[PDB]
UniProtKB/TrEMBL annotation:
Residues bound to (R)-4'-phosphopantetheine 1: S37
Taxonomy of the source species: Eukaryota, Sar, Alveolata, Apicomplexa, Aconoidasida
Protein name: Acyl carrier protein
Binding-site positions, (R)-4'-phosphopantetheine 2: S37, L38
Encoding gene (name): acpP
Residues of the whole record sequence present: 59 to 137 of 137
TM regions (residue ranges): none
Keywords: Fatty acid biosynthesis, Fatty acid metabolism, Lipid biosynthesis, Lipid metabolism, Phosphopantetheine, Phosphoprotein, Signal
């Protein structure tokens, strides 16, 4: 359990093995690294889909920032 980064590394690695060294920029996920809108939306969809939450259009607008990310996982998922 290493913050949202955990599930974030499993979704980005299972969706498109890339360098997370630019994912956790504490800025944006699809606005910082500039990976891809559809791509980022894919891995993200898997994160929540597995977390069994009620997110959809809030994830992409939350996980984008390390702050909102760990906040969307801590507020929802409680282990």
């Amino acid at each position: 359990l290493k913050s949202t980064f955990d599930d974030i590394k499993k979704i980005i690695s299972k969706q498109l093995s890339v360098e997370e060294d630019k994912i956790q920029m504490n800025s944006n996920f699809t606005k910082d690294l500039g990976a891809d809108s559809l791509d980022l939306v894919e891995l993200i969809m898997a994160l929540e889909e597995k977390f069994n939450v009620t997110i959809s259009d809030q994830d992409a607008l939350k996980i984008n920032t390390v702050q909102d990310a760990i906040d969307y996982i801590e507020k929802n998922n409680k282990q």
